[PDB]
């Protein structure tokens, strides 16, 4: 129809899912992501195979000695390359059929005009102020925002879709759901006691997030294996810190969480790059009601848990 | 007991009294579940799938 | 990276991947990024075009060469030092016996059907090997662990078909149409089968290879044999049609005379007529290079399918289904994607962790829903249960009972579906309790009933399968009130 046959031939068995109209949407669609380690390598390669216009991915990073030996879209001995550029060709690769393109420069330094050439954009491995700088430029354009990382066992994702309208087989009903800014999602009033009791039922996750922005602020980088012992006491002062600040007990995150949350882990990366990628396949082609907003994973206990946060 | 069964499709079903409420989803295989634990208040419904 | 007991682990022993499709492909990119050292890789297809939406491991180019293969090649690129050994084969075959599955630590299935993942299970308890099973299938999945002596088995718990009558005579809906279309290809090219007939039946309670041979297989024939006659036929037995509309046959002659994708569109009845004559042109001519057996993605049997079932629909007066449509319903195909595929082997890795890391207590059966449930659960974690007692397969000294008419069931209809089918036995010999029935090897000359052989209401067999180390006693009943043809006493 509006894709060509070896396009039919090549996404049948989701177009069987989804609809060739929600399969036209993809194709029409540019995803900026952000961050080429563990989890922005799965979410390019689902992006890239369900059939998005375009991806552009943006890495200002080179790849280090402490990353792993192994990395799905990077050649061995790549030691020195810058990231992104070392995961070009395999990537590409995965689906000739995408745009795949490639940004060297810092996200932090990019104009407000970068970004709206983009329909859904994707942070990984960000800081809590870009984070924030950059959900506010999408706001303004009404670009899909999404975030996401992970930390030893565990990971999130968060989606700011703004006022969000989609079609859902009950037939296709059409409706709306309505997002919050980050930064509202990332500073909830705990004092409330309606959110005291809000409290009582949200997942602790939440905390290690907070606990791990803050890391990431404080040091220029997550936690790392190499030093687990410097950290991990270093985590243990932020949690005191983080969770006295906001009136919760810190006993909330248990004071061993540390042993938890090191680390890219192949297949936390698989997971969390799986649901956030699907929210942004989702989010782009308007079919399917989009979790709102945070996506929290355990992969100690098999958890995943959804969490609507900031209003 | 005026209970609900939720699916994993999101189909919502209202009841009210291994059980006979299953025999009647059974006809429209499946495994039962409340808050947790094996089989006003909510049944959710999982299938096993078999593609890979 | 890991705990050092575990990382030794991972690094030390051998694991086996089960498929290296959707799943397969997502299993062996985290086993090996997650530091598996030793994986073997078993599947037994070959690389599809449809295939390429969420098997990442394969590319345009690589269509037509073995999954496995191609699996372990595409790794290697990104990865060199990894040890993997690939089969292009079925762990359904005799070498992949009890001290093969000996070898590993753990088992992952990646499987997309019931009867090799019963298999593999018999062979994971006889071997006393630890299993992780898993299925997906649109955007829900699943994950379970396996231990012989701990959990549950695949088969512990209980895991349909048309009537003859609903097919050759009273058609209702375009699934009797299509499973006719089907029936008719194996009865025209394939292997004739009597549990497949297409002729209506005669013998009505609520009133085929030779002719075609005959013919030299002409279009026009065919056609008027299963279009006009039969639809004549069937309108002599009239108390059918005092109910429910009457069909129309078609007159060949008179036919001749009358946006989504292409494969999306409903095309005319001159349309399909010709389409099945070009496709029987085409199968009638590569029946004699190569009995040929239905695949989906065979252009020109996919084509007789849809049009015969379209041919027959418009016949009995329902709306004619898009090749697309059809396609999914003979095939049987299940939607599919990347996500799905990619967080659920996310999760057998993270099982696989937990159990050669001795923490099976804190093994879950896990589901992916597509929404959260009331405790907000995206992913539903769930209790290992023990092993069901009376379990057909992972019970000592299992028994069932069937019943069957003694004198109008074959010695075949055992060996096949019965023991095969119903019971997932691969390479079973079978022996009376008082006879050897069936051998591994051999007895080709007893599939021609078990009466004649001292069976009766109340004799017992023996089945083995030495394979899957499995024996099954078997507990008959007779009756000849059966519907059907047997039925596993519950
Ligand atoms: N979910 S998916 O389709 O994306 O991927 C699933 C993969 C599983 C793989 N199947 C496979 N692999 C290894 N052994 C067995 C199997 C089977 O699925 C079965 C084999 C048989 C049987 O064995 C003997 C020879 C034979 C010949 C023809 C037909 C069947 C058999 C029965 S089931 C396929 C896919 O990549
Ligand atoms: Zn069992």
């Known amino acids: 129809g509006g894709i060509s046959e070896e396009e039919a031939a090549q996404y049948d068995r989701q177009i069987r899912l989804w609809g060739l109209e929600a399969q036209k949407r993809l194709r029409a669609s540019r995803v900026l992501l ?37 990395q799905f879209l990077i050649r061995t001995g790549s030691v020195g390359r810058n990231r992104a550029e070392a995961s070009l060709e395999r990537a590409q690769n995965l689906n000739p059929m995408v745009d795949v393109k490639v940004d060297t420069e810092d996200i932090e330094k990019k104009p407000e005009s970068f970004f709206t050439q983009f329909d859904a954009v994707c942070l990984t ?71 005291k009791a809000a409290l009582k039922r949200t997942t602790s996750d939440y905390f290690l997030l907070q606990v791990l922005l803050k890391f990431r602020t404080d040091k220029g980088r997550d936690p790392s294996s190499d ?59 308007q079919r399917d009601p989009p979790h709102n907003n945070f996506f929290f994973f355990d992969g100690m206990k098999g958890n995943g848990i959804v969490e609507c946060l900031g209003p | 007991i ?3 069964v939720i699916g994993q499709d999101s189909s919502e079903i209202h009841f009210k009294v291994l059980k006979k409420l299953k025999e009647s989803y059974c006809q429209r295989s499946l495994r039962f579940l409340f808050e947790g634990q094996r089989i006003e208040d909510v049944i959710e419904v999982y299938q096993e799938q078999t593609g890979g | 990276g890991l705990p050092r007991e575990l990382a030794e682990a991972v690094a030390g022993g051998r694991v086996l991947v089960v498929g290296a499709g959707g799943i397969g492909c997502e299993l062996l990119k985290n086993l090996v990024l997650t530091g598996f050292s030793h994986i073997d890789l078993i599947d037994l297809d070959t690389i599809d075009v449809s295939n390429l939406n969420r098997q990442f491991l394969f590319q345009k180019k690589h269509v037509g060469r073995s999954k496995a293969q191609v699996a372990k090649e595409s790794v290697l690129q990104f990865y060199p030092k990894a040890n993997i050994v690939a089969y292009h084969d079925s762990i359904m075959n005799p070498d992949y016996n009890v001290e093969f599955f ?71 809906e375009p699934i009797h149409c299509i499973v006719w279309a089907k029936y008719l290809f194996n009865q025209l090219f394939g292997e004739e089968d009597a549990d497949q007939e297409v002729s209506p039946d005669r013998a009505d309670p609520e009133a085929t290879k030779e002719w075609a041979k005959s013919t030299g297989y ?46 999306q569109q409903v095309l005319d009845v001159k349309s399909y007529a010709r389409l099945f004559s070009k496709s029987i042109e085409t199968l009638r001519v590569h029946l004699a290079e190569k009995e040929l057996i239905w695949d989906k993605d065979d252009p020109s049997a996919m084509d007789f399918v849809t049009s015969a079932a379209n041919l027959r629909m418009h016949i009995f007066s329902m709306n004619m289904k898009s090749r697309f449509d059809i396609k999914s319903m003979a095939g049987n195909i299940i939607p599919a994607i990347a996500t799905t595929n990619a967080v659920i082997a996310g999760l057998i890795v993270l099982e696989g962790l937990k159990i050669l890391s001795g923490k099976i207590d804190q093994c879950r059966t896990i589901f992916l829903n597509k929404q959260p449930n009331p405790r907000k659960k995206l992913l539903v974690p769930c209790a290992l249960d023990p092993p069901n007692p009376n379990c057909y397969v992972c019970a000592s000294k299992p028994e069932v009972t069937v019943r069957l008419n003694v004198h109008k069931v074959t010695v075949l209809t055992l060996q096949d579906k019965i023991v095969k089918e119903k019971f997932a036995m691969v390479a079973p010999d079978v022996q009376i309790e008082d006879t050897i029935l069936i051998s591994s090897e051999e007895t080709e000359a007893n599939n021609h009933k078990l009466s004649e052989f001292g069976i009766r209401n109340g004799s017992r067999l023996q089945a083995d399968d030495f394979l899957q180390d499995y024996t099954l006693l078997i507990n008959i009943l007779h009756s000849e009130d059966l519907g059907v043809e047997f039925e596993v006493v519950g």
């Open chain 3, 102 to 172: 000996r070898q590993f630590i753990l088992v992952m299935n990646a499987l997309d059907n019931r009867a090799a993942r019963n298999h593999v299970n018999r062979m994971c308890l006889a071997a006393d090997v630890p299993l992780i099973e898993s299925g997906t299938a649109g955007y829900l999945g699943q994950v379970t662990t396996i231990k012989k002596g701990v959990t549950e088995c695949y088969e512990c718990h209980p895991k349909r078909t048309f009537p003859g009558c609903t097919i050759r005579n009273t058609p209702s």
């Open chain 3, 218 to 263: 002409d279009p026009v024939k065919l056609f008027t044999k299963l279009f006009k006659d039969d639809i004549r036929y069937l309108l002599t037995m009239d108390k059918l049609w005092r109910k429910r509309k009457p069909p129309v046959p078609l007159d060949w002659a008179e036919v001749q005379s009358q946006l989504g994708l292409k494969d």
């Open chain 1, 34 to 70: 952000v961050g080429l380690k563990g989890l922005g390598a799965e979410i390019a390669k689902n992006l890239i195979l369900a059939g998005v216009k375009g991806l552009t991915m943006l890495d200002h990073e080179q790849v280090t000695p402490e990353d792993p030996g192994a």
């Open chain 2, 2 to 4: 005026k209970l609900k």
């Open chain 1, 227 to 285: 030093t687990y012992e410097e950290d991990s006491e270093l985590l243990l002062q932020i949690r005191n810190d983080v969770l006295d600040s906001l009136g919760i007990s810190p006993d909330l995150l248990p004071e061993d969480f540390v042993r938890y949350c090191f680390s890219e882990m192949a297949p936390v990366c698989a997971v969390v790059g799986g649901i956030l990628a699907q929210e942004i396949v989702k989010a782009l082609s």
């Open chain 1, 125 to 195: 491995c960000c800081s809590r102020d870009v984070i924030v700088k950059v959900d506010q430029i999408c706001h303004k354009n009404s670009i899909k925002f999404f975030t996401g990382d992970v930390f030893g066992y565990h990971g999130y994702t968060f989606a700011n879709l703004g006022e969000h309208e989609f079609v859902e087989e009950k037939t296709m009903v059409k409706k709306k759901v309505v997002f919050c800014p980050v930064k509202e999602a990332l500073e909830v009033d705990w004092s409330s006691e309606k959110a």
